[PDB]
Design a protein around this ligand. Structure first.
Ligand SMILES: OC[C@H]1O[C@H](O[C@H]2[C@H](O)[C@@H](O)[C@H](O)O[C@@H]2CO)[C@H](O)[C@@H](O)[C@@H]1O
Ligand SMILES: OC[C@H]1O[C@H](O[C@H]2[C@H](O)[C@@H](O)[C@H](O)O[C@@H]2CO)[C@H](O)[C@@H](O)[C@@H]1O
Lengths: 649, 649
């Protein structure tokens, strides 16, 4: 056997790990399958994509086209349906009819060998007809054959009877393909909509308590759900809900020693009261959790729990499974670190004494929470546990429960971030919070919406309990508004951490990304009712951004994204499309000064000619404009963070 | 099983066609194996390359290093030995000693847990020692263990006794490797020196005749060999040596009708006198060919024959194997084309009626010429015959005779050119003749000496019977000198077509790359003795260029190549290295005007500090200079095309 086939079809993409791991999509998502396709000699080729479903049924006729002249790189868009493991193949072939037409259009006018040319056409169309399944279609082609062979008609009309739009459409549907050659199949994992598309809200239930009982419970915190749903969120992310250790408990503002009342850090998991399968006694019981989950469900909210594989020194594992930790010669276990950050309140897990026991216990714990209606997990610092351990764990869980979604909370070097996604993580945290200038956002999103999108789905949190960027610190509310618009329009999954709405932006000190009086170390009650009454929350904007996402299929996908040039460094423009839905966004990244600029739209990228003028509506205001190749904008911080426009019919 | 191992080792290169085809090298050639290597957490990794020979014997210890900070991309240089199929593996591992050192260097000075730290070191070094095979090495490590454990000494000195250069060198040779993880093996094809390195001369034997017998024979043409060898060539490329058809024979200057005396085009192969396994009767017999081959061999010249799979209409195949041709409805066969070029004197071969017969006959013909001492074939227009046909043919021939070298004469689009090389062609013609400005040369050679070099070996013909570039037309002799220097110094394989020495540069017309009175259509006797006597040949320069190549291992390889900036667009500079051999070249690409410029050498790329000054000798003149970071050059066309300098000890 030869590696290369009769008609070369090479380097099909997407591909992950040379075919050893699947490429990704979700139900209803469109992406490009491509390949390098050409033949020997000078005649034309064609190609097409055969997408097969989990039962092996091929999808519809999907012809490809050359993506740029001289490159022999061909592509077509395909769309994933039901969930499961699919496959895709590229078929390449000689296209004798295109070749013959092109020659015939020169030779019949210039009078060279006309009978021989037309008879050669007739025989092609005869072979075309044999492989057409439909009777009306077959009769149409055999009619063009008899017109091609009628030697009493002028040559130009024998020809034109084979170039009619009626024949075109039969051949575009059932073309004559010579020497059909197939690539080896490549795997596609199709997962549920929520893996790619969703709005996420993070809050600490303990903070939502009462005057008589400041430490909130699942029952008091449930009161916070109707407002979260009213802001248009789909997922609630809860930091760890388990008991919290006492030995080396941290105090307020990340101090080493807790006082008597201090609540500790939820990530310091485990005490005599329980471990990763228990509920912190001050939050309530497993039943109170079921109630919280049930009430979330009625409002269209799914719960995501934090899974953090590590232990306080008081966790039961510390004595039940000493071999899950690395011990130093004196018997002690070194606290976990993430330089320059130190975690004096926890121990890391060691994996090389009993990898089987840890895997077995990890899936037991996830299955526990899954039985209680949690189908989504944020996996904390996955990059400090082995890559292959996550590969195994995710494959075990997704083998019985393929709807479960895992989110990799890894802010680390690129290779590890990409590898985690490739080995099964449905979603990834990103470098979003550190991309704030126009060049940074353009470069980064070009990467995420390009080839990386075949294996990674990004979750754009505009802030987290660990990240209050200097942009928000110095920019105030106008900066909060800009980052919300950006995050909500550039990724189909985005989120915020409670407090973001109120523009909380006081840092621990100058040059830090920690919050002052961080919620991680203390109860943080908030006056939601006052902020709403006084207009000092951006909840309305957030609510509107999520409404726009729900009304615009273009914002529920990632890969179709184009940046349009402007003449000001502080103003950025881009568009996204999905069928007949087109959304155009223009953002002023200066939160302090008003910016005016001309936005020069790449009109072909919108499906329009250069001279055209198109009606848009700014969905943030309800105002309508008429926009074409070149448009003046004026963006004043406080008043207008951005225009978020839809293209009208 | 998981795809990813305990210590991730990913995306090893070079790789060709996802591992389905081998990467390439020749005996004694060095290239870089690389990989993406990292681990979970914060401890250090190391890696190494295990290169295995055809019998499976591993090469020496070959540690890798990170190529740039923060990238997790690791590399090392390996060197291929004997010919055959080798394999290479990357091994990745935790490097506990590097990790412990780095921690210990902070914790001992700052006085934290010092006894515990030093005891942890002692135990690592104890495990190191157990695995060391040498007695003196083992005693050295166990000495450092006892110094580390001596609690009566200050902590800083217990430590310093484990960081000595004597211990360093033991551990760099036999390091402690945790959790060794291996990549899957990748294939390497190692071929003979000549596949990468050689100087090639093309001439038509028929043109080297006498007054009494103008059509040369193998016996008269042999008289031309001593001068070819004296010019330092290693390979003689002969256009087709078979009988030449009469039907539609072309006349002089590519005219359609031959007169009675016209000799025809050698590529129009075949008559009743014979086909691809015969000798043209005017060239002599098979015995005269053996004599020619033998006399070439005595001078250190190998023969490369042209293999052109096509037929004159008088070729015996036309009636013996009609199914090897595509016939039109009236039974005629269309002449071959290569738009806009037409080949009215030949028929192309069709491959889809009897691919097995064509393959079998093709290898029969190549084995015939191989029995007569031809171990190299230039395959004419391979891109008009199926890719898979060549893949099959080359694998059949190389399976019994792996020393046979094939050269792809394909000037076409990039995808086909790369594919031909990947499927087995030892050598490829290139776009060299159309890269003449400094930007064009820099861009192109950066491509060829980069990743493409794992599958393609370039042959830089400065001219061919079909290519007389406008640069040579307008530039005269000074242009011929420049292109010879460039071709000879930028690729380890280069060549010329006879007449190049004499600066033949009259085109067929303005805007054509054909020669006037082309040798393809007529006998072209040349007065070599007169040109030598009158100094009107650049034979001396050519002779000197090949001598320099034979005396400088850096010019007998392709991958080590760096371009150095100059302040003039017409002046280009570059260096090449191989062990302690460094060659530095500066060329003036203006053939009409003298150019002066400053050459600013990237000194680190030469293995030198910025302030240093290095002695060089211009091997074209014997003149010596002293050169450092910034050097004035003055290059006058006619006098000085270039400096070709060696770095002196
Ligand atoms: O109690 C352990 C530490 O918890 C936090 O650190 C978390 C961080 O908030 C989370 O996003 C990251 O992925 O994991 C670390 C460790 O679980 C506190 O900020 C630390 O001060 C605590 O020591
Ligand atoms: O006789 C056939 C044709 O031979 C030449 O064309 C060659 C050309 O020289 C070679 O380098 C190219 O790759 O292949 C063609 C065909 O063999 C003449 O230049 C043509 O005019 C002849 O028709």
């Amino acid at each position: 056997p030869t590696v290369v086939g009769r008609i070369p079809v090479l380097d099909v993409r997407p591909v992950v790990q040379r075919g050893r791991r699947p490429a990704k999509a979700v139900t209803g998502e469109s992406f490009e399958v491509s390949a390098t396709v050409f033949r020997e000699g000078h005649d034309a080729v064609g190609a097409n994509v055969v997408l097969r479903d989990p039962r092996g049924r091929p999808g519809p006729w999907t012809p490809m086209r050359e993506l740029a002249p001289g490159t022999d790189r061909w592509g077509a868009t395909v769309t994933a349906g039901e969930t499961g493991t699919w496959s895709y193949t590229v078929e390449a072939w000689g296209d004798p009819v295109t070749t013959w037409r092109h020659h015939a259009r020169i030779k019949i006018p210039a009078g060279l060998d006309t009978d021989l040319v037309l008879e050669e056409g007739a025989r092609l169309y005869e072979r075309a007809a044999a492989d057409v399944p439909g009777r009306e279609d077959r009769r149409e082609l055999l009619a063009a054959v008899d017109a091609l062979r009628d030697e009493s008609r002028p040559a130009a009309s024998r020809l034109a009877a084979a170039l009619t739009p009626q024949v075109d459409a039969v051949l575009a549907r059932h073309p004559l393909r010579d020497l059909v050659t197939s690539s080896d199949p490549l795997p596609l994992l199709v997962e549920r909509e929520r893996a790619l598309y969703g709005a996420w809200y993070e809050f600490f239930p303990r903070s939502e308590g009462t005057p008589h009982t400041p430490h909130g419970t699942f029952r008091t915190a449930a009161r916070r759900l109707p407002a979260i749903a009213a802001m248009g969120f789909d997922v609630v992310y809860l930091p760890p809900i388990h008991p919290i250790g006492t030995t080396h408990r941290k105090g307020r503002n990340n101090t080493l020693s807790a006082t008597g009342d201090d609540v500790g850090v939820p990530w310091a998991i485990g005490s005599p009261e329980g471990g990763h399968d228990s509920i912190h006694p001050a939050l309530g019981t497993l039943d109170d959790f079921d109630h919280f989950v049930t009430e979330a469900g009625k409002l269209g909210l799914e719960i995501a729990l934090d899974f953090a594989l590590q232990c306080s020194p008081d966790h039961p594992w510390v004595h039940k499974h000493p071999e899950w930790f690395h011990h130093r010669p004196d018997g002690t276990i070194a606290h976990a670190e993430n330089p320059p950050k130190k975690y004096q309140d926890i121990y890391p897990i060691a994996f090389d004494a009993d990898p089987d026991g840890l895997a077995t216990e990890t899936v037991r714990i996830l299955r526990h929470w899954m039985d209680h209606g949690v189908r989504i997990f944020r996996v904390d610092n996955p990059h400090t546990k082995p890559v292959a351990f996550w590969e195994r764990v995710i494959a075990d869980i997704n083998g019985t429960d393929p709807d479960v979604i895992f989110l990799a909370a890894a802010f680390t070097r690129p290779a590890m971030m990409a590898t985690l996604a490739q080995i099964g993580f449905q979603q990834s945290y990103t470098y979003f919070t550190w991309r704030n200038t126009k060049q940074e956002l353009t470069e980064y999103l070009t990467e995420l919406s390009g080839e990386a999108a075949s294996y990674m789905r990004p979750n754009f949190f505009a802030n987290t309990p660990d990240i209050l960027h200097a942009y928000l610190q110095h920019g105030g509310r106008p900066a909060f508004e800009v980052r919300a618009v950006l995050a909500a329009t550039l990724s189909p999954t985005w989120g915020i951490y409670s407090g973001y709405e109120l523009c909380e932006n006081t840092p621990l000190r100058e040059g830090s990304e920690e919050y002052l009086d961080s919620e991680k170390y203390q109860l943080k009650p908030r006056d939601w009712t006052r902020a709403a009454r006084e207009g000092t929350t951006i909840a309305p904007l957030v609510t509107r951004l999520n409404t726009i996402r729900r009304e615009n299929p273009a914002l529920r996908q990632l890969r179709d994204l184009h940046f349009h040039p402007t003449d000001k460094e502080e103003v950025i423009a881009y568009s996204k499309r999905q069928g007949s839905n087109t959304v155009l966004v223009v953002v002023n990244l200066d939160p302090r000064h008003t910016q005016e600029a001309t936005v020069s739209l790449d009109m072909p990228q919108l499906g329009l000619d250069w001279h055209e003028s198109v009606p848009v509506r700014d969905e943030l205001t309800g105002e309508t404009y008429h926009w074409g190749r070149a448009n003046y904008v004026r963006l004043e911080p406080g008043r207008t963070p951005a225009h978020v426009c839809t293209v009208l019919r």
